[PDB]
Design a protein around this ligand. Structure first.
Ligand SMILES: Nc1ncnc2c1ncn2[C@@H]1O[C@@H]2COP(=O)(O)O[C@H]3[C@@H](O)[C@H](n4cnc5c(N)ncnc54)O[C@@H]3COP(=O)(O)O[C@H]2[C@H]1O
Lengths: 72, 72
């Protein structure tokens, strides 16, 4: 697996832009699936509750992000 | 999510960082395979001859980039 899906269910990250984001080891956001649309994420893209995040990275770092964003 | 491989075979774009690349369309480089290693691209990553760029985005622009980078 090189593409992982994380659900953004953490209120503390609502409206945060990717350009400010706390990247673990390092990850790329491949797509954000939001309200029937798949968006190509860039610096000014903001997270929203319920986003389906498609990410790529080493599993260790993906795991941290999954924990923080989906499991809190 | 579709990913496409683009060989960086055009010396003209050699050494250009992603932060300066003249993107003409909606795209993200998801990975770059270089020296048999899969790396996670950022602003400071420089294009190198022979890079295998794994990209996602508008197919229209993927085609244009392919023209620019591996037809040249
Ligand atoms: N995988 C990739 N494919 C194509 N181009 C790439 C790229 N990774 C970086 N870049 C290009 O470099 C800028 C610089 O990147 P950086 O990593 O330094 O600085 C970034 C970054 O940490 C954050 N960001 C934007 N998109 C991101 C994404 N998909 N994943 C994670 N962070 C992202 O916003 C900062 C400013 O974003 P902005 O897009 O407005 O500005 C971008 C974009 O034009």
């Amino acid at each position: 697996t090189s593409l992982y899906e994380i659900q953004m269910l953490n209120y503390k990250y609502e409206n945060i832009q990717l350009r400010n984001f706390p990247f673990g080891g390092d990850i790329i956001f491949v797509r954000i699936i939001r309200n029937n649309e798949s968006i190509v994420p860039h610096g000014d893209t903001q997270l929203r509750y319920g986003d389906r995040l498609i990410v790529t990275g080493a599993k260790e770092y993906v795991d941290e992000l999954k924990q923080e964003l989906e499991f809190y």
